[PDB]
Amino acid sequence: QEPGSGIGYPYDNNTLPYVAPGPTDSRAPCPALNALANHGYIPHDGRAISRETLQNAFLNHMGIANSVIELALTNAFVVCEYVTGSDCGDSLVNLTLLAEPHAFEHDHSFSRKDYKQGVANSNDFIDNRNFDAETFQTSLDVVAGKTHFDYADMNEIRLQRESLSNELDFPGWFTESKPIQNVESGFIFALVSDFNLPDNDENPLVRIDWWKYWFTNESFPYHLGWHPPSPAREIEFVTSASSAVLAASVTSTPSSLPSGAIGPGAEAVPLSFASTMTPFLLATNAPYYAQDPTLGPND
Numbered sequence: 001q002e003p004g005s006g007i008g009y010p011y012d013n014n015t016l017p018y019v020a021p022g023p024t025d026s027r028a029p030c031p032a033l034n035a036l037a038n039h040g041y042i043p044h045d046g047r048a049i050s051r052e053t054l055q056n057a058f059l060n061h062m063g064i065a066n067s068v069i070e071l072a073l074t075n076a077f078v079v080c081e082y083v084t085g086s087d088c089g090d091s092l093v094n095l096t097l098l099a100e101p102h103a104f105e106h107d108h109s110f111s112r113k114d115y116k117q118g119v120a121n122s123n124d125f126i127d128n129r130n131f132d133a134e135t136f137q138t139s140l141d142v143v144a145g146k147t148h149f150d151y152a153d154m155n156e157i158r159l160q161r162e163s164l165s166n167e168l169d170f171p172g173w174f175t176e177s178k179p180i181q182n183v184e185s186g187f188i189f190a191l192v193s194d195f196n197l198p199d200n201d202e203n204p205l206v207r208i209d210w211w212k213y214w215f216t217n218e219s220f221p222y223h224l225g226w227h228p229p230s231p232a233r234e235i236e237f238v239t240s241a242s243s244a245v246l247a248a249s250v251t252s253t254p255s256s257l258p259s260g261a262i263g264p265g266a267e268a269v270p271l272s273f274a275s276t277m278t279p280f281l282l283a284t285n286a287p288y289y290a291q292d293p294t295l296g297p298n299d
């Protein structure tokens with residue numbers, strides 16, 4: 001928000017306004033990075049981003065501590081080197097390369113289509129990077145009519161998304177990614193679980209309106225009473241939430257789940273790519289921004 005608005009106070013005392021990305025700006029498949037770039041907490045053009053810039057942006061403007069993004073930072077730079085063909089050092093070339101498929105970006109996302117979702121031919125690919133309202137609706141439908149949801153609900157959400165993607169993706173494309181997705185499940189609980197409820201750290205409940213605002217708008221739901229978590233969320237909360245999602249009992253089992261979908265997931269570890277492997281072509285679409293309505297500087 002505008003610095004003088006005081007909208008983030010006393011949780012964030014140095015805010016910057018929302019600015020929609022222009023056609024030439026680089027955006028990510030990540031709603032968090034996109035919100036940060038939209039505010040200029042990382043570069044608005046989404047290019048040339050250092051680890052510390054990311055660490056500070058997450059800590060000071062989203063209440064996400066450094067520990068939470070340690071592996072994500074490692075993996076971002078691994079993917080940068082893979083996509084560009086050379087070491088990116090401490091300047092992430094852009095946000096868009098993070099949408100390299102079957103890498104950090106993965107199938108059965110909550111709010112993005114898959115790289116080969118619904119394509120008529122095998123060489124074809126689509127926008128697996130920008131927010132897709134329809135896909136996100138498929139996630140929200142699982143918790144229709146509710147204001148909050150828990151770990152068991154999130155487990156049902158990710159299962160529905162796995163089922164849908166496995167059915168709709170070009171044959172042979174779909175590749176399950178429980179470890180990465182469920183870190184991201186933990187991230188959702190970390191950012192938009194309802195810290196105003198008395199037992200948030202034991203049984204955190206996601207506020208659906210906060211989640212929808214963050215994902216659809218790629219900006220922060222201050223207008224709905226959100227603020228950065230204080231103290232900042234740490235990695236233990238995230239991986240604990242990730243484990244709890246996967247441990248939750250399934251009351252409705254969708255068809256066409258990949259083998260082993262139900263049950264615990266592997267711990268996320270650093271990505272690695274063969275020096276011989278050429279990266280998949282990145283989707284080239286202009287960055288998404290909200291238009292129904294468009295956002296002002298304080299939204």
Ligand code: HEM
Pocket residue numbers: 029030031032033054058064068069072073076098099104105106107108109110111112184185187188190191
């Ligand atoms: C340097 C730090 C980060 C990097 C490089 C990063 C990168 C990515 C990438 C490549 C994806 C796409 C995965 C896919 O859905 O196919 C993603 C998704 C996602 N990220 Fe980030 N991320 C970071 C930090 C965070 C943080 C701190 C949060 C929230 C606390 C967050 C929230 C999410 C969520 C919820 C998704 C899933 C979106 C969906 O499934 O539609 N990310 N991130």
Ligand SMILES: *[C@@H]1O[C@H](CO)[C@@H](O[C@@H]2O[C@H](CO)[C@@H](O)[C@H](O)[C@H]2NC(C)=O)[C@H](O)[C@H]1NC(C)=O
Pocket residue numbers: 209212213214216217223224290293295296299
């Ligand atoms: C995206 O953000 C816009 C702008 O903040 C949201 O629309 C506003 O929502 C606030 C409460 O958050 C209301 O007080 C305003 O009346 C709304 N303004 C306008 C212009 O409609 C919008 O709801 C957000 N989208 C989602 C899905 O959360």
Ligand SMILES: *[C@@H]1O[C@H](CO)[C@@H](O[C@@H]2O[C@H](CO)[C@@H](O)[C@H](O)[C@H]2NC(C)=O)[C@H](O)[C@H]1NC(C)=O
Pocket residue numbers: 024025026027083084093094095096097279280281282283
């Ligand atoms: C983000 O960076 C990536 C990596 O450099 C860009 O993707 C490459 O773009 C060049 C054109 O300049 C192509 O020759 C390569 O084929 C692309 N690589 C892949 C794997 O697709 C990407 O264009 C950049 N995006 C933005 C919006 O800045």
Ligand SMILES: *[C@H]1O[C@H](CO)[C@@H](O)[C@H](O)[C@@H]1O[C@H]1O[C@H](CO)[C@@H](O)[C@H](O)[C@@H]1O
Pocket residue numbers: 283284285286
């Ligand atoms: C990205 O750009 C490529 C070359 O410009 C195209 O071959 C791709 O199909 C893809 O195009 C899509 O996104 C761009 C926005 O940059 C639009 O100009 C196209 O209409 C298309 O949606």
Ligand SMILES: *[C@@H]1O[C@H](CO)[C@@H](O)[C@H](O)[C@H]1NC(C)=O
Pocket residue numbers: 009010011012013
């Ligand atoms: C914001 O400023 C107020 C008043 O000085 C202070 O009490 C609070 O700790 C500040 N918040 C942060 C995150 O520094």
Ligand SMILES: *[C@H]1O[C@H](CO)[C@@H](O)[C@H](O)[C@@H]1O
Pocket residue numbers: 178179180182183186238239240242243246264265266267268
């Ligand atoms: C989230 O974190 C837990 C614990 O590391 C994993 O089991 C899960 O697969 C996901 O990565």
Ligand SMILES: *[C@H]1O[C@H](CO)[C@@H](O)[C@H](O)[C@@H]1O
Pocket residue numbers: 235236237238239240243267268
């Ligand atoms: C989540 O899981 C990680 C290991 O993947 C732990 O280090 C953390 O304490 C939490 O239980």
Ligand SMILES: *[C@H]1O[C@H](CO)[C@@H](O)[C@H](O)[C@@H]1O
Pocket residue numbers: 200201202203204236237240241244
């Ligand atoms: C790990 O931490 C999460 C979030 O605080 C809890 O919900 C879970 O029960 C475990 O203690």
Ligand SMILES: *[C@H]1O[C@H](CO)[C@@H](O)[C@H](O)[C@@H]1O
Pocket residue numbers: 239240241242243244247
């Ligand atoms: C990971 O952690 C969660 C939360 O403590 C457990 O529910 C799960 O069984 C796994 O050990």
Ligand SMILES: *[C@H]1O[C@H](CO)[C@@H](O)[C@H](O)[C@@H]1O
Pocket residue numbers: 248249250251
């Ligand atoms: C775990 O428990 C649930 C109820 O919470 C059952 O519906 C499911 O079959 C599983 O045993």
Ligand SMILES: *[C@H]1O[C@H](CO)[C@@H](O)[C@H](O)[C@@H]1O
Pocket residue numbers: 142152153156250251252
């Ligand atoms: C069991 O409850 C789950 C939520 O955990 C629903 O998704 C499902 O429809 C069934 O009622």
Ligand SMILES: *[C@H]1O[C@H](CO)[C@@H](O)[C@H](O)[C@@H]1O
Pocket residue numbers: 141142156157159160163251252253254255
């Ligand atoms: C039970 O509920 C789940 C989640 O909503 C569905 O994916 C499944 O098909 C069944 O309707």
Ligand SMILES: *[C@H]1O[C@H](CO)[C@@H](O)[C@H](O)[C@@H]1O
Pocket residue numbers: 249250251252253254262
């Ligand atoms: C749907 O069915 C699966 C087995 O196919 C169970 O694991 C789940 O608990 C739900 O009843």
Ligand SMILES: *[C@H]1O[C@H](CO)[C@@H](O)[C@H](O)[C@@H]1O
Pocket residue numbers: 253254255256
């Ligand atoms: C597809 O499969 C699921 C369980 O695997 C069923 O619940 C459903 O009725 C359909 O046959």
Ligand SMILES: *[C@H]1O[C@H](CO)[C@@H](O)[C@H](O)[C@@H]1O
Pocket residue numbers: 259260
């Ligand atoms: C389906 O296949 C996979 C092998 O990747 C197993 O992990 C699973 O238990 C099931 O047999």
Ligand SMILES: *[C@H]1O[C@H](CO)[C@@H](O)[C@H](O)[C@@H]1O
Pocket residue numbers: 271272273274275
């Ligand atoms: C990570 O692991 C891969 C295995 O494919 C290697 O190719 C790479 O050089 C790195 O050691």
